Amino acid sequence: IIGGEFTTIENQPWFAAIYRRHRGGSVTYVCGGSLISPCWVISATHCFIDYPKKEDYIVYLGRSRLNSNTQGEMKFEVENLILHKDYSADTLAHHNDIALLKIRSKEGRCAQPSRTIQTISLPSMYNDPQFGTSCEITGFGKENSTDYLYPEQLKMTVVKLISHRECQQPHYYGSEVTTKMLCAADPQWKTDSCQGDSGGPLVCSLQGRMTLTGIVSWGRGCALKDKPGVYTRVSHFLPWIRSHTKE
């Protein structure tokens, strides 16, 4: 996250921190995710597509720091890693950038809700906030494009939804951004998602409910003029989510 503020998990309790273990035993951060029910975290396919082996992954809930422990945090492995069969990546745009991780503790349990671990509601079909709506994003992504390391402390920021019409302007993304995606940015281009924020939530308050409106997906640079953050439009994937969150 460029700009914005440091935060802590109690303020973003649906946020899931996703890591990958390497031969040699070192663990690196991969992407954010969001707890949509106790057994299920939702994230972005591009985070996993090159290493689609569920055993490699570690998910933390209730965690506020990258490389140290948080009181009340809970560790999970991935019981099922589900990637969207139609995922693809063009030069800029990622399509069907959505994934599901079925989580389970070493004892075989799903998440236990607490003060720092809570589900976020899914949106309903084709009911997204209007353009100009302010929403929040959270993540451990870069604070500056020139950084090579991630911040140690979770960040959040607030961005405004951009219309599909504006996002498709020539100096924005033209036809590369589709109706299955949402653009959001800061009107002064001072705050944005960035590398490492992928998979994390874009949360909008809709009819008095915190809703998972988007998932961090792609963009051109970070907080660049006329280049919004692009988000998977979760409301368009309700059938896919519903079908994969079963048996």
User: Which are the catalytic amino acids?
Assistant: 46, 97, 198
Q: What token pair was written down for 16?
A: 């899931």
Nearer to ligand L1R, 123 or 219 (CB): 219
Give the bridge partners for 59, in sequence order.
Answer: 18, 76
Binding of ligand L1R by 219 (CB under 6 A): yes
Nearest-CB residue for ligand L1R:
219
d(CA 28, CA 17): 11
Sequence length of the chain is 247
Binding of ligand L1R by 93 (CB under 6 A): no
Stretch that binds ligand L1R, among 159-167, 169-177, 216-224, 235-243 (CB under 6 A): 216-224
Nearer to ligand L1R, 111 or 186 (CB): 186
Residue 191, phi then psi, degrees to nearest 5: -140, 150
Number of residues near ligand L1R (by CB under 6 A)? 16
Binding of ligand L1R by 157 (CB under 6 A): no
Find the binding residues for ligand L1R in span 181-210 (CB under 6 A).
192-195, 197-198
Q: What token pair was written down for 7?
A: 């935060």
Binding of ligand L1R by 46 (CB under 6 A): yes
d(CA 176, CA 63): 35
Binding of ligand L1R by 216 (CB under 6 A): yes
Q: What token pair was written down for 158?
A: 């607030």
d(CA 165, CA 67): 41
Nearest Cα residue to 229 out of 83, 50, 97: 97
The residue ranges that bind ligand L1R (CB under 6 A) are 30-31, 46-47, 192-195, 197-198, 216-219, 222, 229
